[PDB]
Amino acid sequence: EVPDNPPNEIYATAQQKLQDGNWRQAITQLEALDNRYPFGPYSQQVQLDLIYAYYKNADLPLAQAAIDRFIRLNPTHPNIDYVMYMRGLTNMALDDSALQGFFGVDRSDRDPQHARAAFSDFSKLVRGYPNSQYTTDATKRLVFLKDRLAKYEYSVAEYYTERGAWVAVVNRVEGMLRDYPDTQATRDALPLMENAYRQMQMNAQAEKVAKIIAANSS
Amino acid sequence: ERVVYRPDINQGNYLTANDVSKIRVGMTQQQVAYALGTPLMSDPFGTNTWFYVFRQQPGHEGVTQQTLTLTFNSSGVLTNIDNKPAL
Amino acid sequence: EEDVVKMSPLPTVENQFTPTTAWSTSVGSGIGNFYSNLHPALADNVVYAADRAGLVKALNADDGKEIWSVSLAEKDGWFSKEPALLSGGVTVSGGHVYIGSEKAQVYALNTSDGTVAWQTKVAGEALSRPVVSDGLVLIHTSNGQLQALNEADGAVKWTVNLDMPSLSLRGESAPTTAFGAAVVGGDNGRVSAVLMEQGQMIWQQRISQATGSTEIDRLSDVDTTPVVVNGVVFALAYNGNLTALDLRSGQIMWKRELGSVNDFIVDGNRIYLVDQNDRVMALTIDGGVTLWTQSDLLHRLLTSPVLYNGNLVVGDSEGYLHWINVEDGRFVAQQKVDSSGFQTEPVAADGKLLIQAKDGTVYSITR
Amino acid sequence: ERPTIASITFSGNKSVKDDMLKQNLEASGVRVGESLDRTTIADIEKGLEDFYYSVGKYSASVKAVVTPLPRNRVDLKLVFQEGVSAEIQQINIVGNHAFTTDELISHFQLRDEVPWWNVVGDRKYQKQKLAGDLETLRSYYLDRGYARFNIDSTQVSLTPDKKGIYVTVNITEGDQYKLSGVEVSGNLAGHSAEIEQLTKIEPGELYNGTKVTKMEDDIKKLLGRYGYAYPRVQSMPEINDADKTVKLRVNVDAGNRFYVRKIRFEGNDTSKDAVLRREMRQMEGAWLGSDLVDQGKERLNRLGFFETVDTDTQRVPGSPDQVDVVYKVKERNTGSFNFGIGYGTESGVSFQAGVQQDNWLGTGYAVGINGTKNDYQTYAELSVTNPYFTVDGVSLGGRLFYNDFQADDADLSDYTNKSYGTDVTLGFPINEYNSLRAGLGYVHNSLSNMQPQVAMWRYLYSMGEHPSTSDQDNSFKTDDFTFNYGWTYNKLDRGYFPTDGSRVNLTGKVTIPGSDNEYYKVTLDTATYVPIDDDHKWVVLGRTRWGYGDGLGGKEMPFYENFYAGGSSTVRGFQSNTIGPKAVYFPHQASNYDPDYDYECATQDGAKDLCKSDDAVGGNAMAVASLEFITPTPFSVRTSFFWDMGTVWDTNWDSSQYSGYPDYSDPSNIRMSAGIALQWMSPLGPLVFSYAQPFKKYDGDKAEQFQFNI
Amino acid sequence: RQVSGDEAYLEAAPLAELHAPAGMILPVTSGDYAIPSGAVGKALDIRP
């Protein structure tokens, strides 16, 4: 695709497709320049344009690629905070690669790994750049992602509950409490653990947990 | 009442009668832990007490729980031993 | 996907006189591709060749009439007449002629009949032409090892290890001796002097590298055969990088690393050779001072060269023969003595030229 | 400024992974945006011809193209002046004194006998393959009793043309000994007796090292039952060269037990972790026996909703009991939409498509929709499967299908059998591969005014009806409450493309009164894989079906259940279902509908003198034969050479009437069509098709040697 | 420039660090929920 041309005009076309959204041709010409004038300063400005469109294009592999390449290219750069947030964004994006939830679907139960990666990125942000232009967005992504992992683990426990491994269950509920007694999944799960213990006559813990959700009967 | 098809309850963290005799009173936390492998059941919020569970039924014929649970004082010291078989 | 760089064919065909094919005694293959010395030798109108499985013959040097044959393939065991893969040269010493299996089983052969004097296991297949050392045959096994055997029975005089290799550049170091100074090529570009008596390193030396992470010429079928004219030695490098040194020294007299050579001989002042380029260079004794090269059958896979009637011979892999005017310096005669072609030593003793085609058992030419 | 390295253009490799040489280029400090080092032309040429020397060539020079370009950008071509790779000519096994050398190649990976009578890879060389052969030979003695055996050395030569490799082995042939006895030693932890029995050697028998290792790691697994991750156990032989025997030290030592805490899976985004975590018969929160992890793995494999079952245990750092399991799952996703079309004249070319999502959302719910068509007999199919209806694993599969052909060719009467029906399958996994099923099959059919055909009318009287013989008028609607069953034992490898295992599809179908057509029958499918190449790339492909009709009350196979073959998988090369009894019509005249002497199938428009007709309709019994050998296409894919053979027939074909007309009660009428079980991959998906040689064509069969899709 | 995606953020419950009867605490603190411009959604525009 790449027509070689004056580099100023290369960045010109890049910005054209940028304001428009033709992420394909934009990324083509940007990569063209960083094949033509790659180690130049505004060529990492070109690289920022690249990561920008790569997400705007919903092209996540090269997104991770160029973002990490930018990090290894600079520990702290003008746009590096936006880069950090965009990394968190593309990770959480991988976690929502599919969007079936509106076909009457749930995603609270698939792979909880990119969610851990995004949770980490937003942690490193909320305490590593915790004054950015992206504070509360990341913050609410944080809280939601967290109750999301929560409901995930809760569903897992429910599974086992239907299986029988009441010990596995109890441990899941525990590890959830020790990762959270806040996220709705907590109050959701609690009876899981309780009937579990009941499947084990460890009724002591059962009524203890009963009082637990009792004081938290909401 | 017309299903011979049932599984066997493949859950453990069980006990050996060896494991039974393996521990006596006031034996310290780390000591007993190594002497019996780490546990997996212990109150989220109560004392240091510990549980240890055996679990099975081979399908339609009796369910064999066998848990010993294990009380523990402040300073990681055993305080009481508490077994329980099926039912 | 086989674009191997083929070479010029027989150029400017010329025969100043008649390459009279004395005869063509084709006793029976033989070798195959199977690069190996196995070169046939003679004694007193009686010449000797061998198969690649145990068959050995002794012939007339007037017509190639068979004086007698023998087989050797072991008549029992893991194969009824097991292919013994004779690969040593043809070493003649009185009543005893010698042969080298590819099973480390030398066979001293009673010349008079073909009686197997003694078969002796050695440190490996006997790729190099066994050399006689006056009671001692000079077996240079595959695995860098080197052992002499009593001509009478095969008493292992010693077991000099040597220049152990990594990737087997063809370790047919044809050992030689000078006044009782055992010399031999090596597998890692390292000639080594040896006590002829009982194999003690009289000195070592390094000339060239050797293929494998340090690669050298592997289209130069090196005369791993140190020639020793008067005590200034002349050793071919494992990639033909020339050298000359004091017999009991190894100290370099000079060296033309330019050389990367298949085989060689020397006369008086001119040395000769077959560089990997497959072109001799008429070379004076003093240094690699050149008289002339001739790149005519450049890069064609050749045999050793040899002299004849004061004329130099050289064999091709395609039964062509390329007598060269020794001083200038190109061909004088030519004949397709075979299609089968060959690689092994053209032998020219007693003014009688000898070849065993790589399968086409012995041919023998004259003029 | 010499920079920058900017161009990398591999050219002339033609045989390798160019990017391997690119990682080498970086390993030589060369790649785009790097310091343009004009010097390195010869340097990298050396490095990469050395790469050729690595890959077993040493016979491919290279030419690099420095291209002075402006300040930053540069051009570079890498001309790989290739030749012929290194070639192996022969092996030697020195010191061999107990077995034929060539026999002691007869197990070798590498070889020199690949001539135009024997095929074993090729005579290239890679020291790794060498070492494999080494250890192979090593075993080859150690099993026998040759303790002291070793490999003194080896080396490999170069014909002074860089063409010829030589192979050399230097051995010391062991001097066989008779192993005396075994000694357990160390941690058995109250598991002695068993272990001891896992090693009940013959008294003082020969040494057999691999048999030992078997005893060893079987003791390992033995313990794994009792839950020990890495039961570090050592087998040590103590040589008695004096008597020429050796004793055995079994250094036993176990680990610890209650291990598995939190089993991660991975990359299942397409697929509900619930179902995955069901496809692991190791219930968590308990100890570990890695065989349980495996049996799991295999279950995940058979599901097929995956691509790689890669397991990885993990001792969680902090306490030996903290041990937990990941599952790197790289399962592929398939929208299974394929429309195979049959061509072959004019009154019989359609075919059928699969429009199936293959477990929508990976919910653990495969759901079917299929459609087919023939001149008149047009059928669809639709389904929904609940692989996990209950906690145990019960599979529940809804089924639905529609014949909607009232024979609208003219208006009707042209085999009107618009015929739908539906059913469920309460599938059990009766045993860990055994599975009978059950269901209540039901189906509506309506026949009306069909062109008369001996089969149909024998049916009607088997029905006990008296339809006016030579008349395109008679009608018959029907339904049926059918009781179902059927059996299947799958222990295959991968549900989409397998390697080996048992596939059987017993489908027991019967009926019950309150229904219209009272009858019984049964079918069964036979198919399996098993490899010939033990690299699990060439595989034998079993396949055969067995057709059988019947009927209670003396009634007949309700001929909407007539089996078929011909066209796709059933047979090859033929046209769709064109195999078996091609029906025959009475010398019929009165059709109540005479076209312009169109519809010449035994109507008033001429058409007397019973038309021995070539309309494949098939009958109550069938079998097709299919045995095949994968060639992992050496040119998701597998390629065999289909040659298959099939036959159909009616039992109740009473030749009395059919006397002067080709008998269709003779099962021995097996056709044959030969070809090659072809399959490809282009950047669009799992491409596959067939093309056969319909030689053994019987009387009037109808072929279209091509086939498309899979 | 609005956030391509949800704002189910805004329906996530303000996580009630739970509240139990006495002597029944659980070490949550493994987490990282520090509590400190930038819009939420529409004007949450990622122009650098």
Residue type, D25: L
Does residue B51 lie in a domain region?
yes
Q: Touch between chain D and chain C (3+ CB pairs, < 8 Å)? A: yes
Does residue B80 lie in a domain region?
yes
The DSSP-derived string for A115-127 is HHHHHHHHHHHHT
CATH class of D334-710: mainly beta
3-state secondary structure of D94: coil
Instruction: Note whether C183 and C245 are within 8 A (CB).
Output: no
Dihedrals phi, psi of C162, to nearest 5 degrees = -165, 130
- My answer on whether omega of the bond before C12 falls inside 30° of 0, hence cis, is no
Q: Residue for token digits 């009289």?
A: C202
Whether domain D85-176 has CATH 3.30.70.20: the reply is no
Q: Residue for token digits 């066998």?
A: B66
Calpha distance A29→A53 (Å, rounded): 12
Does residue B1 lie in a domain region?
no
- Where exactly are the structural domains of chain D? 2-84, 85-176, 177-256, 257-333, 334-710
Interface of B with A (CB under 8 A): 9, 11, 13, 40-41, 43-46, 51, 53, 55, 65, 67, 69, 84, 87
Calpha distance D695→E47 (Å, rounded): 70
Calpha distance C85→A158 (Å, rounded): 74
Instruction: Note whether D170 and D95 are within 8 A (CB).
Output: yes
Instruction: Note whether D2 and D36 are within 8 A (CB).
Output: yes
Tell me, yes or no, if A117 comes closer than 8 A to chain B by beta carbon.
no
Q: D177-256 and D257-333 share one CATH topology? A: yes
**Packing angle between helix A7-20 and helix A41-56, nearest 10 degrees?**
30
Residue A166 DSSP one-character state: H
Kind of pairing, strands D380-386 and D369-373? antiparallel
Mutate to test the interface with D, among A36, A110, A156 (most CBs of D within 10 A): A110
Dihedrals phi, psi of A130, to nearest 5 degrees = -80, 40
Q: Quick one: closest CA in A to B68, which residue? A: A202
Contact C218 D50 (CB under 8 A): no
Give me C289's structure tokens.
């001072």
Q: How far is CA D434 from CA C13, C54, D393, D427, D523, in A?
A: 82, 63, 13, 11, 17
Mutate to test the interface with E, among A30, A70, A139, A184 (most CBs of E within 10 A): A139
Closest CA to C224 of C277, C254, C267, C184: C184
**Chain centre distance of CA C210:** 19
3-state secondary structure of C133: coil
Task: Write the burial class of residue C337 (CB in 10 Å: 0-12 exposed, 13-18 middle, 19+ buried).
Answer: buried
Kind of pairing, strands D87-93 and D164-172? parallel
Q: How far is E16 from chain B (nearest CA, A)?
A: 18
Measured between beta carbons, the chain B residues lying within 8 angstroms of E24 are: 44-46
Calpha distance D270→D358 (Å, rounded): 12
CB atoms within 10 A of CB A102: 6
Chains touching chain C through at least 3 C-beta pairs below 8 angstroms are: D
Closest CA to C146 of C133, C206, D93, D90: C133
Instruction: Note whether C27 and C49 are within 8 A (CB).
Output: yes
**Chain centre distance of CA C123:** 20
Cα within 13 Å of Cα(C132), Cβ side: 15
Instruction: Note whether D165 and D89 are within 8 A (CB).
Output: yes
Instruction: Note whether D492 and D498 are within 8 A (CB).
Output: yes
Instruction: Note whether C112 and C175 are within 8 A (CB).
Output: no
Calpha distance C9→A175 (Å, rounded): 83
Q: Touch between chain B and chain D (3+ CB pairs, < 8 Å)? A: yes
Q: What is the CATH number of domain D257-333?
A: 3.10.20.310
Q: Quick one: closest CA in B to A164, which residue? A: B9
Q: Entry resolution in angstroms?
A: 4.2
Q: What is the CATH number of the domain that holds A135?
A: 1.25.40.10
Interface of D with A (CB under 8 A): 4, 6, 32-33, 72-73, 261-262, 264-274, 277-278, 283-286, 361, 391
Give me D327's structure tokens.
């599952």
Q: Residue for token digits 């492909």?
A: D541
Residues 6+ apart with CB under 8 A from D512: D481, D482, D483, D518
Dihedrals phi, psi of D235, to nearest 5 degrees = -105, 125
Kind of pairing, strands C181-184 and C192-195? antiparallel
Beta bridge partner(s), residue D333: none
Calpha distance D183→C244 (Å, rounded): 64
The DSSP-derived string for C173-235 is ---EESSSEEEE--SSS--EEEETTT--EEEE------SSSS---SSS------B-SSSEEB-
Alpha-carbon radius of gyration of chain B: 15
Measured between beta carbons, the chain A residues lying within 8 angstroms of B40 are: 167, 170-171
Q: How far is A133 from chain D (nearest CA, A)?
A: 31
Residue type, A68: D
Instruction: Note whether D357 and D270 are within 8 A (CB).
Output: no
The DSSP-derived string for D604-658 is SSS--S-EEEEEE---SEEEEEEEEE-B-------BB----EEEEE-SS--HHHH
Residue D174 DSSP one-character state: -
**Packing angle between helix A80-95 and helix A41-56, nearest 10 degrees?**
20
Chains touching chain A through at least 3 C-beta pairs below 8 angstroms are: B, D, E
Calpha distance D260→D289 (Å, rounded): 10
Does residue B60 lie in a domain region?
yes
Contact D273 A110 (CB under 8 A): yes
CATH fit for domain D177-256, picks 3.40.50.300, 2.60.40.650, 3.10.105.10, 3.10.20.310: 3.10.20.310
Name the strand (E) or helix (H) holding C106: strand C105-110
Residue type, D195: I
Architecture in CATH for domain D2-84? Roll (3.10)
D247-D250-D255 Cα angle (round to 5) = 175
Task: Write the burial class of residue A139 (CB in 10 Å: 0-12 exposed, 13-18 middle, 19+ buried).
Answer: buried
Contact A159 D278 (CB under 8 A): yes
Measured between beta carbons, the chain D residues lying within 8 angstroms of C119 are: none
Dihedral, D284, D285, D288, D291 alpha carbons, nearest 10:
-10
Instruction: Note whether C335 and C323 are within 8 A (CB).
Output: no
Q: How far is CA B10 from CA B38, D262, D284, in A?
A: 19, 16, 9
Where chain E is discontinuous (C–N > 2.5 Å), the residues before each break are 36
Where chain A is discontinuous (C–N > 2.5 Å), the residues before each break are none
Calpha distance D413→D588 (Å, rounded): 14
Dihedrals phi, psi of D452, to nearest 5 degrees = -65, 140
Beta bridge partner(s), residue C355: C363
Measured between beta carbons, the chain A residues lying within 8 angstroms of B37 are: none
Alpha helices in D143-229 (DSSP H): 192-197, 209-225
- Where exactly are the structural domains of chain C? 3-366
Q: Residue for token digits 């078969």?
A: C119
| Residues within 8 A of E (CB atoms), A 65-104 only | 79, 82, 85-86, 93, 96
Name the strand (E) or helix (H) holding C257: none
Q: Supply the range of the domain harboring residue B29.
A: 10-87
Experimental method: cryo-EM
3-state secondary structure of D212: helix
Is the Cα torsion angle C160, C162, C165, C171 positive or negative in sign? negative
Calpha distance A97→A95 (Å, rounded): 6
| Residues within 8 A of A (CB atoms), E 19-38 only | 19-21, 24, 26-28, 30-38
Name the strand (E) or helix (H) holding C167: none
Measured between beta carbons, the chain D residues lying within 8 angstroms of B13 are: 258, 285-287
3-state secondary structure of D675: strand
Contact E26 B44 (CB under 8 A): yes
Beta bridge partner(s), residue D403: D419
Chains touching chain E through at least 3 C-beta pairs below 8 angstroms are: A, B
Dihedrals phi, psi of D358, to nearest 5 degrees = 65, 70
Name the strand (E) or helix (H) holding C76: none
Q: What per-residue string of b and e applies to D74-92 under the rule 16 or more CB within 10 Å gives b?
A: bebebebebbebbbbbbbb
